[PDB]
Give the backbone structure.
Amino acid sequence: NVLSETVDQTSPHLSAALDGVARFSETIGKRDEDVKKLLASANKVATVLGDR
Amino acid sequence: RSLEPEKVNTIATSLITIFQGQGGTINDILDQTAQLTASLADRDQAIGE
Amino acid sequence: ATASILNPSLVASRVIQLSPPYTGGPTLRDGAVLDVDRTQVPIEYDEVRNQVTRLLADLGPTPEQPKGPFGDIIESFADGFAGKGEQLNRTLRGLSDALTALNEGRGDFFAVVKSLALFVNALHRSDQQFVALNNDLAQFTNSFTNTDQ
Amino acid sequence: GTLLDEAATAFGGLGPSLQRLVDSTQAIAGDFRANIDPVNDIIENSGPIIDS
Amino acid sequence: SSAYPTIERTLAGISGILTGGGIPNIEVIQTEVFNILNGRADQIREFLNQLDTFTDELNQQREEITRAIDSTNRLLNIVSQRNDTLDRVLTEFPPLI
Amino acid sequence: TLFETITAISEQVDPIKLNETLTAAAQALDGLGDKFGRSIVDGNAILADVN
C-alpha cells in the first residue's frame, strides 16, 4: 500500500524530472572524451598550483 | 526459493520505514531537480564552449 | 547424517531417508541417537491448507480495498508509469553515460580537489593583502602612464 | 499488460548501462566521502580570495 | 459457444511463464535489494530528507549558476582566442624571470 | 472459473518482455547491492556535511 500511494503521489511530477535529467545528462554524456581530457589537464595544472 | 520469509520481511519493514509519508519530499525533489536540470541544459552550447 | 521423513507422493508409505550419502570419514556407529536438531518431517496437507487460506485472506481484497494490495500496486504502477517508458529509458542511458564518464575521470577530479584545497587553504587568509596588492599595482602602473608617450 | 509493456520499453537492454551507472555512483560517493575535508576547505575558503 | 480452460492449458501457460520469463533472476534481484535495505532504512529516509534540502538549495541558486556559466564562457572564449599570446608568454617569460 | 481466471491473468504476462525486464533488472545490481547501500550512507554523510 505504501508503494502504491507513493507512486500515486509522485507520478505527475516525474516526467518533467526525467526530461530535465535526461537533457542535462546528455549535455555531458556526448562530451565524454573532452571531459576526461579536461580533468587530466586540470589535474596536471592544479597539482602544479597546489605544490607551489 | 525467492519467497524466503527473512528477506521479504526485512524488505517490507525497510520500505515502510523509508517511504512513510515521503510523497511530499519526493515531489519536491522531483520538481526542484527538474527546474535545476532544465536551467542547466538550456546552456548546452555554453557548457560545450 | 540427517534422517528425514518423506512422503513420496499423494498416497504412499512415508520413509526415513538418510540424506547425506557416505563419502568417507567417520561413520554412524551402532546405537547412535539422533535428536530433533538433525531430523526432518514432511509438510503435511493441513499446514498447506492453513497457509494458503491465511495468505489468501490477509493479502486478498477487502471491503475497504476492493482490488487488494497487489491489484492496487499493479494499477498504480501501470497508470503512474504510462507513457514514461521511453523517457525513463533515455534518462537512464544519459545518466549512465555521464556517470561513467565522470567515474573514469574520478581520480583526476579528486586530485584536482585535493590540490585546489591546499591552494585555497594557503591563499585564503591574505584577502586584504590581495586587495592592497591590486591597488598598489594600479597606483604603480599609473605613475608611468600619465601622458600618452 | 500495460505495465509489462512499459517495463520492457524502459528496461529493454539496459543491463550493462544500469550496472555501470550503479558502480559509478557507489565509487563516486565513496571517494567523495573519503575526500570530504578538501571539499569543505574549498567551499569555506574560496570565498575570501574570489571576493578580494 | 465457448470452452473453459483445462487444467492442462492452465498449467501449460503457467509453465510457459515460469520457463520463458526469466524467473531465476528474481531470486538474485530481491537478494541484492535486501543488501541495500538491511539496517539502513532510517539512513535512507534521512538521506531523502537531506537530498530534498540540497536540491532546493541548488535550485535557489540556479540563476547564479547560469550567470557564472555565461561569464566563464565569455572569459574562456577571450583567452582561447588569445591562446597564441598565452603560448608566447609561456615560452619567453620563464627564462627571463 | 479458477482456471479461466488464471488463464486470463497468464495471457497478459507475455514472458518475452518479462524475461528481458527481469534480465535488465538483475544485471543492474548483479553484484553490487551492499555497495549501493553504503553509497547511500556515504551520500547521507556528504549532504550532512555540505548543506
In short: Helices of chain E lie at 7-20, 24-37, 41-59, 62-80, 83-96. The interface with chain B takes residues 26-27, 30-31, 33-34, 37-38, 40-42, 44-45, 48-49, 51-52, 55-56, 58-59, 62-63, 65-66, 69-70, 73, 76-77 of chain E (CB under 8 Å). The two ends of chain E are 101 Å apart (CA to CA).
